[PDB]
Design an enzyme around this catalytic site. Structure first.
Site: not given
Ligand SMILES: [Cl-]
Ligand SMILES: Nc1nc2c(ncn2[C@@H]2O[C@H](COP(=O)(O)OP(=O)(O)NP(=O)(O)O)[C@@H](O)[C@H]2O)c(=O)[nH]1
Ligand SMILES: [Mg+2]
Lengths: 170, 166
Positions: B56, B61, B64, B103, B114, B123, B127
């Site tokens: 991903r 952004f 991942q 997660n 990521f 986040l 995270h």
């Molecule tokens: Cl998210």
């Protein structure tokens, strides 16, 4: 002539939003889970003799990014609210999705269908009466579906279009 | 670093070498989480990241990856078992290069991670941040270009090799 409807598929993670959408668009099912970020699809259909274009926005189950999710709801004309019949928490989550839609669209009367998916499975935790009673309390239809067997898939989307058309008559 | 380990990934695009990314793992502040990533990078427990995919990638952004058990974005496992708790939230997602755990909600860290390509402060507190890119941010920027708005990559981005630097 034809019409066009913006349909938005919402509900908790893993309930089958994408599998239902892919059955409608691509006529197949796979067991593999591919978690959604966001996807859009278009399909021409005939419902009650009337041709229309369905614009389907398949949303992720997550409810962060309120700015983006509010925009989904502002643009959407009708909402499939999906839970899984073997996931009680996903049924309990339905209220929140409906409250957000009503708030964003400034209305108590937004076209919606309650969808109980995965009815092929032997692990039911939400019975039909529970769901029908909830849908009755909202004044919306309840449709039981299986994306795996394709049971109810067309019905769920076509019923949502019927709900939009009824709302536009008011 | 005099205290924090350095690990590397050799990144490939459909099997062709793209370049090396190295990471400082903040064992001084996030020891359990850093040790998990270190050990998965050397493969010393008998499993880990080598061969796995960045499944991903979303421009603007993050990149991942890390699912070496299901190989489809749903899996992963730590050196402590399938999941482990959020260790702390001392460090924040302050900009490109931050290395943080993916997660499925609270206390579900496994192996997916990521690499931020921008500040992702929303986040913070959700995270666990545990490292940063040391060398090869240009390689991360190159990976980012194979992503798309829904995360699907136009070519398969993999960790062709990985390990710990002396
Ligand atoms: Cl998210
Ligand atoms: N047996 C059965 N499995 C189903 C059914 N619908 C979906 N699944 C399975 O349930 C899992 C999740 O389905 P998916 O459509 O990806 O769910 P989602 O609601 O789109 N998840 P997300 O919120 O992450 O986008 C997949 O493994 C899928 O094959 C169904 O009717 N029956
Ligand atoms: Mg989905």
């Amino acid at each position: 002539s034809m019409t066009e409807y913006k349909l938005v598929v919402v509900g908790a993670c893993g309930v089958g939003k994408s599998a239902l959408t892919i059955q409608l668009i691509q006529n197949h099912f796979v067991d593999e889970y591919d978690p959604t970020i966001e996807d859009s699809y278009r399909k021409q259909v005939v419902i009650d003799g009337e041709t229309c274009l369905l614009d389907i926005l398949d949303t992720a189950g997550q409810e962060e990014y309120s700015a983006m999710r509010d925009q989904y709801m502002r643009t959407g004309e009708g909402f499939l609210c999906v839970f899984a019949i073997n996931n009680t928490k996903s049924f309990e989550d339905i209220h929140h999705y409906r409250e957000q839609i009503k708030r964003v669209k400034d209305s108590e009367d937004v076209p919606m269908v309650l969808v109980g998916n995965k009815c092929d499975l032997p692990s039911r935790t939400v019975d039909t009466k529970q769901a029908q009673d909830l849908a009755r309390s909202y004044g919306i239809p309840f449709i039981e579906t299986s994306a795996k067997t394709r049971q109810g898939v067309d019905d769920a989307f076509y019923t949502l279009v019927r709900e939009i058309r009824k709302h536009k008559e008011k | 670093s005099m205290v924090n380990p350095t690990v590397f990934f050799d990144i490939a695009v459909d099997g062709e070498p793209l370049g090396r990314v190295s990471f400082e793992l903040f064992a001084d502040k996030v020891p359990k989480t850093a040790e998990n990533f270190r050990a998965l990078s050397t493969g010393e427990k008998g499993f880990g990241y080598k061969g796995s995919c960045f499944h991903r990638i979303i421009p603007g952004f993050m990149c991942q990856g890390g699912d070496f058990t299901r190989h489809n974005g749903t899996g992963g496992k730590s050196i402590y078992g399938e999941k482990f708790e959020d260790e702390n939230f001392i460090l924040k997602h302050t900009g490109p290069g931050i290395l943080s755990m993916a997660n499925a909600g609270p206390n579900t860290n496994g192996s997916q991670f990521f690499i931020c390509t921008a500040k992702t402060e929303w986040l913070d507190g959700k995270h666990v941040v545990f490292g940063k890119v040391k060398e090869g941010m240009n390689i991360v920027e190159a990976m980012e270009r194979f992503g798309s708005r829904n995360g699907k990559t136009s070519k398969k981005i993999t960790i062709a090799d990985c390990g710990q630097l002396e």
